[PDB]
Ligand binder design. Structure first.
Ligand SMILES: Nc1ncnc2c1ncn2[C@@H]1O[C@H](COP(=O)(O)OP(=O)(O)OC[C@H]2O[C@@H](O)[C@H](O)[C@@H]2O)[C@@H](O)[C@H]1O
Ligand SMILES: Nc1ncnc2c1ncn2[C@@H]1O[C@H](COP(=O)(O)OP(=O)(O)OC[C@H]2O[C@@H](O)[C@H](O)[C@@H]2O)[C@@H](O)[C@H]1O
Ligand SMILES: [Mg+2]
Ligand SMILES: [Mg+2]
Lengths: 394, 394
């Protein structure tokens, strides 16, 4: 098995000022291909060391993938280092320069001189278009080997990588991963519910991964084994599984609302807006989500329809019900969600951080669910958002 | 300046099954010393590739540090790789083996035979005690160079490292770093404004880090050189610096509101609640943040005060101003922020994705800023949140 080598470029990655997730994500994407990943590197933004590491990775590898340092600044040296490592001159491509200039023109700016180096390439490179930023990537095919340069930000490189990857002509191997997403059941109860299905052979293996949106059950390995094992696991957890793969609670809610021709609105306290944020993260949200209130003060709560009598007891089922009913009446939506409780770090009304009520008001009345969540302030806010969503799709 | 090499060992680190914080944490611990970290590696649990990387690392470095693979399983091969890489045989230390047998006896168990190999070390190694786990570390002094082996778990290695590090006799250099957080200036303008200040020497260097919350400018290296160069730099960027170090936009906004005794509300369209969520992320936000509305439907935009005549150009500076003025009136807050625009993927009102207006209303009036953000839907939404917060801290 030939090697894939994967280098994250950036001094800030060495120190973990940002944690390098790119090399790992790229390693994971390579699992359906018959390439060995023996190591990954993070490399400082310095031309001579980077060139040395690139030259060495390329010598030993079928595929070398770099991310980062394609920007316009003196700390962005990946293109100069790669051209040094491959023994090729960097050449300005006028057409790409024109494209960057147009990108700045559209935004009402003249292109600064520093951007020019983003349009440089070596003879062996073809361009990988980047509609999400100013630095296009490179794909170098040379001597039967591939070297791919990607911009550092994941929102920019992910769809570039996704497109180039099948074009590389890499040898395949039958791998698959199936992600089964559950809610309201702990790791232990899942293991025990599965029993012999909880396989950990080298052909195929099952794992449990607790997340803020519930425990994932992940099946990975040889594609045939994954498909069959995942089917059987899915049956054992049929009541707990709310979606798979790319499905999210926010998208499942969207599917339900569009199936019913229904609308949704929200009123939030401790989640601060994060619930409306999560609903609207999914394209098409405006077809059903009418909007929401962030009632983060007594005055706002009263103004938008929560009864005076409840205002001094916010950590309660009665409050979560009244807020969902207030939202529904204010927006006239088919359904409304509410969140109230203690995020942390301080207790509130004698209740510890993590004490949360979420409520759903619909045509047939209201329901409330109480949780006691583990985690710091941000984690409790997150789990509260997924718990309110779960009211509609679990 | 000589090199320090840092290798995290473990196949799971390559794929992100375990997130490699060890290598970065060790690199940060080395900042007080005159050593260059050019790269960090993560390496698979295989004895041949691991020994090759250790050999290469040791050859080029004054210091090598490894973590992980000190366990008792067949996949724990770090001791074997180091011995191989350094051309020395492993030797059983009978006293350490008795300590391991004590560890298992201390918990009512015989020592499994697999744990025997944890008492092996090479002649050039002294032991590093581990009172938290069974694997002692190594300190190898050889050829005026140091190589340290540490166990994978942070609670085990952290005290071990802190104890051995000041014994290694590493050359010290007075280190400092300064992080300047900017908004509303791109990397190229920064390059041009700074010009020759954008130093990249061995004693001191300047870097930029483009984030969704704006460009961070980092100066790091010799203590006297960093203070002067960062002061000059901050003076060149005075209008655009809104914070330093650990400061965040949400915290900066909190500071201003507490300084003035002022309150804040929001009205959001495209950001969907994300702006409220970012404001309330910081503990103590309830002292100034009254709440907000998410006016996602045209009906909600009209309900919360956007004038009828603007509902056909909700993506405009006039509407953003009207939304901020409405929120301010609706909540009776000192200030209000509003967001409106085109998140993507589809255009809206003829305007392309990334077209965003943010506005601030206060006692002295309202103001609006327009942006054209490249990026996918989630990125446009995030940038808009920070753009709105930047109106209050410039
Ligand atoms: N290994 C990594 N893992 C996770 N995130 C990363 C990594 N490397 C970079 N990032 C993220 O990307 C950010 C920018 O990293 P750079 O290396 O500077 O990316 P660069 O390739 O130079 O491009 C920067 C910007 O310039 C534009 O022309 C280009 O389109 C991009 O918008 C980092 O601050 C970090 O948030
Ligand atoms: N680079 C890393 N970054 C962060 N955490 C890490 C890293 N490497 C390991 N860890 C953490 O430590 C855990 C164990 O990693 P191993 O490499 O297996 O640790 P190892 O040195 O082999 O020792 C494991 C156990 O065996 C004992 O004898 C030894 O004392 C330790 O208790 C990992 O699951 C992870 O939680
Ligand atoms: Mg860059
Ligand atoms: Mg181990």
């Amino acid at each position: 098995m030939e090697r894939a080598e994967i280098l994250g470029v950036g001094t800030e990655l060495l120190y973990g000022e940002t944690l390098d997730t790119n090399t790992a994500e790229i390693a994971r994407s390579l699992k359906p291909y018959a390439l060995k990943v023996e190591r990954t590197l993070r490399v400082a933004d310095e031309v001579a060391p980077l060139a040395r590491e690139v030259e060495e990775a390329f010598a030993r590898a079928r595929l070398v993938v770099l991310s980062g340092g394609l920007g316009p600044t003196p700390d962005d040296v990946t293109r100069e280092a790669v051209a040094l490592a491959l023994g090729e001159p960097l050449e300005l491509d006028e057409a790409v320069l024109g494209e960057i200039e147009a990108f700045f023109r559209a935004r009402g700016r003249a292109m600064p001189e520093a951007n020019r180096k983003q349009a440089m390439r070596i003879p062996s490179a073809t361009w990988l278009k980047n509609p999400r930023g100013t630095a296009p990537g490179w794909w170098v095919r040379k001597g039967g080997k591939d070297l791919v340069l990607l911009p550092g930000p994941p929102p920019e490189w992910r769809p570039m990588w996704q497109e180039v990857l099948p074009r590389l002509g890499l040898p395949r191997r039958p791998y698959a991963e199936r992600v089964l997403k559950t809610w309201g059941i702990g790791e232990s109860e899942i293991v025990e519910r599965l029993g012999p299905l909880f396989v950990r052979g080298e052909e195929v293996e099952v794992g449990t991964y607790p997340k803020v949106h519930g425990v994932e059950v992940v099946v990975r390995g040889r594609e045939d084994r994954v498909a069959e094992l995942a089917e059987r696991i899915k049956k054992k957890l049929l009541k707990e599984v709310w979606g798979e793969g790319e499905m999210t609670l926010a998208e499942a809610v969207k599917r339900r609302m569009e199936r019913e021709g229904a609308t949704l609105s929200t009123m939030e306290s401790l989640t601060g807006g994060l619930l409306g944020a999560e609903i609207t993260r999914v394209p098409g949200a405006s077809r059903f989500y009418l909007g929401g209130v962030v009632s983060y003060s007594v005055g706002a709560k009263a103004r938008f329809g929560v009864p005076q009598d409840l205002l001094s007891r916010t950590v309660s089922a009665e409050t979560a019900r009244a807020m969902a009913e207030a939202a529904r009446s204010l927006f006239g939506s088919t359904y409304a969600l509410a969140t109230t409780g203690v995020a942390g770090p301080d207790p509130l009304e004698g209740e510890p951080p993590g004490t949360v009520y979420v409520a759903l008001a619909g045509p047939t009345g209201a329901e409330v669910r109480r949780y006691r969540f583990p985690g710091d302030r941000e984690t409790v806010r997150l789990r509260s958002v997924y718990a309110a969503l779960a009211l509609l799709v679990t």
